[PDB]
């Protein structure tokens, strides 16, 4: 209902997780990514080639590269 | 120092530019080509007296190229001789040095002296090295200039054949009080253009420095003749007059 009351200043809201309602395994920070990335992946396809979209998309895209390359070690198991 | 400075400029102007600082960069590369036109175009002090002799160990590394083998076997510099013996004799040992400068960065052979501070040196550094098919092979070759025609004196280029006697004189004791520098400097050319002096008048001193043991001489024919018929003799006139042996060349036969 919060979320409900912010949807109708802007503030976004992300929909409600529950890890219960997960993989085991799988971490809560890239599950957040994931919806995080659900919303400005479908905003920039809104654009489809408006005004700076492509500054938005690969300053994205960028940022989503360099959070891979830390994302591995959060799920490694030991240090190699 | 500019070149590292423009991709960084860029890299910032990816995705955007601001239309002022934008309209700055296009300015400075219309007015950076711009005199580089002109500069080509005044050739077809402080010019050169910059450093004087850290500009010719990098021109022989811009002609080596990447890689521990070079590109150019094979390479003679032009150079107009200066006015004074206390000049030459520091024109020549810059490019000698720079040379050595050269080839000491490459081939770690042992030296006389790391610091020759004199022509002299140089060629007993220089004396160590033989051509071993990637360092660049150097023989200098000095070259005239020929100047407008001055009315007076018996015969219209004579101030310029007495200015030439002056410069050529100077040449000839360099090569006698350092024999030595014969198997450096191999050549002697007049390069300006055809009609402000012509042909005939280098006879009589290219033949004197034959006998100075210079041993090479190469002519420069101007390509700017007044009909295409007066361009092939003034080549007829090269050949016939000038003393040139086998093995030699002309320069810029457009005719």
């Given at each position: 209902s919060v979320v409900?009351?912010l949807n109708?200043v802007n503030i976004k809201c992300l929909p409600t997780i529950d890890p219960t309602k997960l993989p085991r395994h799988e971490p809560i920070l890239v599950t957040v990514t994931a919806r995080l990335n659900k919303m400005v992946s479908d905003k920039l396809k809104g654009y489809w080639a408006?005004?700076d979209y492509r500054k938005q998309k690969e300053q994205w895209q960028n940022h989503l590269a360099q959070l891979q390359r830390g994302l591995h070690l959060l799920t490694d198991k030991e240090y190699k | 120092s500019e070149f590292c400075w423009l991709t960084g400029l860029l890299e910032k102007w990816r995705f955007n530019a601001?239309?002022?600082?934008?309209?700055?960069?296009?300015?400075?590369?219309?007015?950076?080509?711009?005199?580089?036109?002109?500069?080509?175009?005044?050739?077809?002090?402080?010019?050169?007296?910059?450093?004087?002799?850290?500009?010719?160990?990098?021109?022989?590394?811009?002609?080596?190229?990447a890689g521990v083998?070079?590109?150019?076997?094979?390479?003679?510099?032009?150079?107009?001789?200066?006015?004074?013996?206390?000049?030459?004799?520091?024109?020549?040992?810059?490019?000698?040095?720079?040379?050595?400068?050269?080839?000491?960065a490459?081939?770690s052979?042992?030296?006389?002296?790391?610091?020759?501070?004199?022509?002299?040196?140089?060629?007993?550094?220089?004396?160590?090295?033989?051509?071993?098919?990637?360092?660049?092979?150097?023989?200098?070759?000095?070259?005239?200039?020929?100047?407008?025609?001055?009315?007076?004196?018996?015969?219209?280029?004579?101030?310029?054949?007495?200015?030439?006697?002056?410069?050529?004189?100077?040449?000839?004791?360099?090569?006698?009080?350092?024999?030595?520098?014969?198997?450096?400097?191999?050549?002697?050319?007049?390069?300006?253009?055809?009609?402000?002096?012509?042909?005939?008048?280098?006879?009589?001193?290219?033949?004197?420095?034959?006998?100075?043991?210079?041993?090479?001489?190469?002519?420069?024919?101007?390509?700017?003749?007044?009909?295409?018929?007066?361009?092939?003799?003034?080549?007829?006139?090269?050949?016939?007059?000038?003393?040139?042996?086998?093995?030699?060349?002309?320069?810029?036969?457009?005719?």
């Amino acid at each position: 209902s919060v979320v409900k009351s912010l949807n109708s200043v802007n503030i976004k809201c992300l929909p409600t997780i529950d890890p219960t309602k997960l993989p085991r395994h799988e971490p809560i920070l890239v599950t957040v990514t994931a919806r995080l990335n659900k919303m400005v992946s479908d905003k920039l396809k809104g654009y489809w080639a408006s005004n700076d979209y492509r500054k938005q998309k690969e300053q994205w895209q960028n940022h989503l590269a360099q959070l891979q390359r830390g994302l591995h070690l959060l799920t490694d198991k030991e240090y190699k | 120092s500019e070149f590292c400075w423009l991709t960084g400029l860029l890299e910032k102007w990816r995705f955007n530019a601001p239309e002022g600082l934008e309209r700055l960069l296009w300015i400075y590369l219309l007015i950076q080509n711009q005199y580089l036109t002109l500069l080509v175009q005044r050739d077809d002090m402080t010019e050169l007296r910059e450093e004087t002799e850290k500009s010719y160990l990098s021109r022989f590394k811009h002609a080596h190229g990447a890689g521990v083998y070079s590109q150019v076997r094979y390479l003679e510099g032009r150079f107009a001789p200066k006015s004074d013996p206390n000049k030459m004799q520091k024109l020549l040992f810059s490019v000698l040095r720079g040379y050595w400068e050269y080839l000491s960065a490459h081939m770690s052979m042992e030296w006389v002296h790391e610091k020759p501070l004199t022509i002299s040196q140089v060629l007993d550094n220089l004396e160590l090295v033989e051509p071993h098919g990637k360092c660049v092979e150097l023989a200098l070759v000095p070259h005239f200039i020929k100047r407008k025609p001055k009315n007076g004196e018996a015969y219209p280029h004579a101030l310029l054949f007495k200015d030439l006697k002056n410069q050529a004189a100077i040449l000839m004791d360099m090569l006698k009080s350092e024999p030595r520098l014969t198997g450096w400097i191999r050549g002697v050319d007049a390069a300006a253009n055809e009609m402000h002096a012509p042909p005939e008048l280098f006879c009589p001193l290219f033949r004197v420095l034959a006998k100075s043991g210079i041993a090479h001489f190469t002519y420069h024919v101007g390509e700017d003749f007044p009909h295409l018929i007066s361009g092939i003799r003034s080549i007829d006139d090269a050949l016939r007059f000038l003393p040139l042996r086998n093995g030699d060349r002309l320069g810029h036969c457009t005719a």
